[PDB]
Amino acid sequence: TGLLDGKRILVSGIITDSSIAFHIARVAQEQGAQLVLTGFDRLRLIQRITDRLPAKAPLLELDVQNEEHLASLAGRVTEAIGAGNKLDGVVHSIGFMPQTGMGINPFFDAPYADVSKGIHISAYSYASMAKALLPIMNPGGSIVGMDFDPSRAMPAYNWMTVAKSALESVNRFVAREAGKYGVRSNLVAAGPIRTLAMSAIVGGALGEEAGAQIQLLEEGWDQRAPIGWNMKDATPVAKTVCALLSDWLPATTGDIIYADGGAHTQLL
Amino acid sequence: TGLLDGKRILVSGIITDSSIAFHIARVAQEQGAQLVLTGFDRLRLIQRITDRLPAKAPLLELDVQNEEHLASLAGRVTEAIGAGNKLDGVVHSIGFMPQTGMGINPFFDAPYADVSKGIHISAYSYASMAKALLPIMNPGGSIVGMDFDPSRAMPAYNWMTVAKSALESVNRFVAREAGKYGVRSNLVAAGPIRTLAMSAIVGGALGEEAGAQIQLLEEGWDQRAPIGWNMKDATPVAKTVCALLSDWLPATTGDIIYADGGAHTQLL
Amino acid sequence: TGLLDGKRILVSGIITDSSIAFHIARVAQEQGAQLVLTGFDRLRLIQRITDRLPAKAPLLELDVQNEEHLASLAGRVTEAIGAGNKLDGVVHSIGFMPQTGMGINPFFDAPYADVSKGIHISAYSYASMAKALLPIMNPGGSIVGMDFDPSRAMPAYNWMTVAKSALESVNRFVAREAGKYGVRSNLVAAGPIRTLAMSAIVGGALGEEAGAQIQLLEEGWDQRAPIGWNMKDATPVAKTVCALLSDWLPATTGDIIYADGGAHTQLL
Amino acid sequence: TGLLDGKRILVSGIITDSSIAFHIARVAQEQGAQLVLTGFDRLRLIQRITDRLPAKAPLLELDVQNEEHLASLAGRVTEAIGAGNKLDGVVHSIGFMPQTGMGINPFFDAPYADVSKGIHISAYSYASMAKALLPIMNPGGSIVGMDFDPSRAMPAYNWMTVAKSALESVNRFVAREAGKYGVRSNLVAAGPIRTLAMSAIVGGALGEEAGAQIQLLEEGWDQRAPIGWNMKDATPVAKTVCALLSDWLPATTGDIIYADGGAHTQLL
Ligand SMILES: NC(=O)c1ccc[n+]([C@@H]2O[C@H](COP(=O)([O-])OP(=O)(O)OC[C@H]3O[C@@H](n4cnc5c(N)ncnc54)[C@H](O)[C@@H]3O)[C@@H](O)[C@H]2O)c1
Ligand SMILES: NC(=O)c1ccc[n+]([C@@H]2O[C@H](COP(=O)([O-])OP(=O)(O)OC[C@H]3O[C@@H](n4cnc5c(N)ncnc54)[C@H](O)[C@@H]3O)[C@@H](O)[C@H]2O)c1
Ligand SMILES: NC(=O)c1ccc[n+]([C@@H]2O[C@H](COP(=O)([O-])OP(=O)(O)OC[C@H]3O[C@@H](n4cnc5c(N)ncnc54)[C@H](O)[C@@H]3O)[C@@H](O)[C@H]2O)c1
Ligand SMILES: NC(=O)c1ccc[n+]([C@@H]2O[C@H](COP(=O)([O-])OP(=O)(O)OC[C@H]3O[C@@H](n4cnc5c(N)ncnc54)[C@H](O)[C@@H]3O)[C@@H](O)[C@H]2O)c1
Numbered sequence A, B, C, D: 001t002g003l004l005d006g007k008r009i010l011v012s013g014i015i016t017d018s019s020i021a022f023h024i025a026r027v028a029q030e031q032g033a034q035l036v037l038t039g040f041d042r043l044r045l046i047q048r049i050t051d052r053l054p055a056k057a058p059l060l061e062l063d064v065q066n067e068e069h070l071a072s073l074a075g076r077v078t079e080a081i082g083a084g085n086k087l088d089g090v091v092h093s094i095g096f097m098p099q100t101g102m103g104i105n106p107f108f109d110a111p112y113a114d115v116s117k118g119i120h121i122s123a124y125s126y127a128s129m130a131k132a133l134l135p136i137m138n139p140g141g142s143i144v145g146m147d148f149d150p151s152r153a154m155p156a157y158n159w160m161t162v163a164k165s166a167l168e169s170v171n172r173f174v175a176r177e178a179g180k181y182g183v184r185s186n187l188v189a190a191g192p193i194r195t196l197a198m199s200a201i202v203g204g205a206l207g208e209e210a211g212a213q214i215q216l217l218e219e220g221w222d223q224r225a226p227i228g229w230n231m232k233d234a235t236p237v238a239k240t241v242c243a244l245l246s247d248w249l250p251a252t253t254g255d256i257i258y259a260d261g262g263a264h265t266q267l268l
């Protein structure tokens, strides 16, 4: 009955139940998908969080900066899904940028070591995961990553904006590689969502009026979006990622779908 | 379990069983939608074409330049679907440009009367169909128009390129109106498909260069698309339109979804 | 030694001494250009206004909707500039939209007759003027038109936004034709300037909240521009046009240069 | 008389007399500018090369990955130009990418260490040069970097495409900081030019595919550019950079000017 009936899908990036990846996983499961999950660092917490999903799925450790984790990933996925089976979908929902690279911290004062780490995790890892997983993906498959529209500069997002610009470019080359396997590669550019990264990384770097200034972001985004925007609701974004993982967008690759309430199409 | 089960959808633009609109109607019916079709000019002929669809659907006359057809449209649709019921979707799959505006005919020699006619039918009509139909659309509903990426100039498409550019802009303003109703408005920028218009209009205006240009279009597009492109197969485009008509892209509006094999994301 | 020393340049669009074209003309003559001016409708007024320029230039009548004017234009310019001389530059600084297509007047209520007149004058005439003048332009020549970034929808600009979208597309096709003559074609997307068109057309259609709403546009453009924006100063825009008329951007064609304080590059 | 008469301009990125920076330097001196040059590593040979410019100019060592070099840069330039004098122009004409990041080497096989070096040099350094030099730049001044349009993926350019996508994003935030000083920041996206990096980095990484790949690049570019394109001629690009360094584009910042024959505005 489900949009993703029978499909085996790897989903990275769950840390809490407000994670975009959590809702992607939840919707994908409501739609009949069989999941393999990956988690970073706080595996015990992640285990407890994933207990809240509609169906239990194996959790595999993946630090995208750890070459050993990347080299063993496909083997460990095959152990979880069974020999002779392959993935139909992969979700990259991963990002990091040091505090120096965000908020009210002067753009010029972020050392390259920090920026590099951020670009490693948030951009290059999209290609790493594709490298690791394409060899175990079925024709008609779909790789999806999460974006935040970086076409224009803005307060606060700072070097993460630069990392997203890189990610968009990486996705276009991932499409070229993926196409050899009959696999699509796309990004979903989401509007703002109240996640752990929002409050701890972005909010943490904004200093004092962070609470009110995020409320400004919500109000302004919902005003610009012709159909409105709810920062408390990741479901519209999760649904969009599932549309891309499905058979219903079979001719879209190297591309970006905007799940932002149409805010990026309006100036005011 | 159909993607569009229960949905009432108006589909304009069928003229042959190669029409992008025809495959849109076919796929939508396969997925449980209940359709109303609109046709232009030769309605007796169109009815024999629509007879080839999987299921019966009422066929309505609509010339988008005819003010009376537009003023009566919502009432005629309401009769077709039953008083009390509203539309969940609307598909604009219509375009025209006079020969002077196309092909090897010099760009400078198209009189404005001819360009204006093409822009009326191909761009302005997206707004006039939205005006007529929004008052009989449900929240969560979806308006979708057909686009051919006009961001760059090219041989042969000439003034139709300009009409498409206008249409993309018209779509962003329709989104502002549609949102007041909880309705989304998007275009699908399709790759090249073997349809009547490509033959009679584009081919016709290319004269002796039609063959070489159409061949280059078939193979060049496939070459550039990372997942490839079958110009003889409208299904991938029709599926993309159904995705937009569905509940699975609920946060996208005023936007363009590219069902072109990824070709627009690659230079070579 | 002036930027445009010895260049023969046609400049359209002067109506008042606040007109963008007036400032283009002044800066161009300050830089050694020999001008021919074209005016519409109010020829006695334009003659008077142009008496304020650094040098007296011949003024020719041109209503871009008048086929006879267009058909006789090259002949009339050749008279103004001398037989055996050709133009080095052409400036299109022309636009119109009926009130129904602007301001607080509902988008859906603008009749196509109104929209078509707006598009004729604002977009199609860029090609009309190129058709007329390219046969009397020197290699290395430059055609420049005035744009307002229409990539996103916005309040008030309405159907003019659609006309500018069309204009951008027209410019790319003009470039194809102009290249056959060794001539470049480009647009300058300017930020908001206090001109007759701004007060009469835009402010006129904004109703009672107009003078203040226009002030709020200034405030927001200036805030978004990393280098600020002064709506009272056309000179930075005129300078940019002069740069495109000069020999200093010889590799730029089919393109758009933004003289907008950089506001389009920033989200907030 | 000269376009840049009286201006003091720093030009980085000279490595051979085919360097785009060499032609920028030459044209700038021809136009009355006083230069300070920076070079990397091979300073003995760079000095030999700059002795062939029309005018004498101080040459300073700058490795952009060297923190000590950047920390001391403003003081060294001040020594070169005289205390109390400031720079009106800065040209960043610097890029690097390891071979593994380029050509026919598999996109997925580039280790992050290699990509990170390329991004540091090719993108981050645009920000570090701005950080170092803005304190000694005059209001009305101009920072210009060199781009190659990375909006679409393509053969061979591989991870350098990613670095350019990052660089474009960096330029937009540099614009925010530069505007506090009354300074503009922009990129010139150049068409392809035969330089040391083309030969050694791009051509070297293509191997047996270099001939065919570069022929198609060159043929396609000249075909698409409405005014044509000559890969052997850096002067149009050098002129465009000088236009940006001048007073003639005073309202453009955070932006990208294309010196590419108009190629990017045309599909074919
Ligand atoms: N929250 C928003 O408003 C928003 C908007 C647009 C895009 N995004 C993108 O959505 C994605 C999900 O972020 P979120 O908002 O759900 O935040 P989140 O805090 O819920 O998730 C971020 C994830 O990044 C993972 N991560 C960090 N370093 C990692 C590493 N080295 N290896 C593997 N995983 C690592 C963390 O474990 C965490 O699970 C990110 O790409 C984010 O940039 C978020
Ligand atoms: N075929 C392609 O390669 C292609 C690619 C991208 C986008 N498109 C767009 O797809 C849409 C459908 O085109 P298609 O290729 O299926 O061609 P088609 O010939 O099958 O359909 C074109 C339709 O336009 C309708 N039409 C013309 N004038 C009309 C009027 N006054 N009122 C109402 N309808 C009118 C025709 O009757 C016909 O049904 C158009 O917007 C077209 O530009 C086509
Ligand atoms: N003022 C702004 O904020 C702004 C911003 C960006 C772009 N522009 C563009 O700059 C250009 C000049 O406008 P402006 O702001 O200087 O206003 P303006 O009123 O000074 O100039 C508009 C000109 O258009 C001419 N025109 C109208 N109909 C014509 C016709 N049929 N034939 C020939 N000419 C006709 C008018 O006579 C007038 O001279 C237009 O393209 C406009 O869209 C203006
Ligand atoms: N050649 C083309 O077709 C082309 C086209 C568009 C853009 N570009 C860009 O133009 C710029 C100049 O390239 P080019 O083609 O003239 O090649 P080039 O080889 O002449 O110049 C590249 C410069 O980068 C410098 N560089 C490398 N590492 C450095 C470091 N650590 N510190 C300081 N400098 C360092 C090199 O010394 C060299 O001077 C680059 O940004 C390049 O990406 C080149």
Ligand SMILES: CCCCCCc1ccc(Oc2ccccc2C)c(O)c1
Pocket: A094, A095, A096, A097, A147, A148, A155, A156, A157, A160, A191, A192, A193, A195, A197, A198, A201, A202, A217
């Ligand atoms: C106020 C600035 C506007 C941006 C807010 C939206 C947002 C929130 C969180 C996001 O995720 C991250 C951001 C930075 C670093 C890491 C992650 C996952 C993210 O990518 C985007």
Ligand SMILES: CCCCCCc1ccc(Oc2ccccc2C)c(O)c1
Pocket: B094, B095, B096, B097, B147, B148, B154, B155, B156, B157, B160, B191, B192, B193, B195, B197, B198, B201, B202, B217
């Ligand atoms: C070089 C590219 C030329 C072929 C483009 C593909 C195409 C084919 C048909 C299309 O439909 C029309 C084109 C013109 C007029 C009317 C219609 C429906 C259309 O909009 C696009």
Ligand SMILES: CCCCCCc1ccc(Oc2ccccc2C)c(O)c1
Pocket: C094, C095, C096, C097, C147, C148, C155, C156, C157, C160, C191, C192, C193, C195, C197, C198, C201, C202, C217
């Ligand atoms: C509030 C809307 C956004 C600000 C508009 C700035 C502007 C002002 C005048 C312009 O010129 C015209 C506008 C409409 C019709 C005709 C012309 C010449 C124009 O093109 C742009």
Ligand SMILES: CCCCCCc1ccc(Oc2ccccc2C)c(O)c1
Pocket: D094, D095, D096, D097, D147, D148, D155, D156, D157, D160, D191, D192, D193, D197, D198, D201, D202, D213, D214, D217
């Ligand atoms: C076939 C590849 C596509 C055309 C490349 C044109 C080009 C050539 C050289 C360029 O400069 C560099 C490229 C890589 C690394 C460093 C530099 C300076 C560059 O940035 C662009």
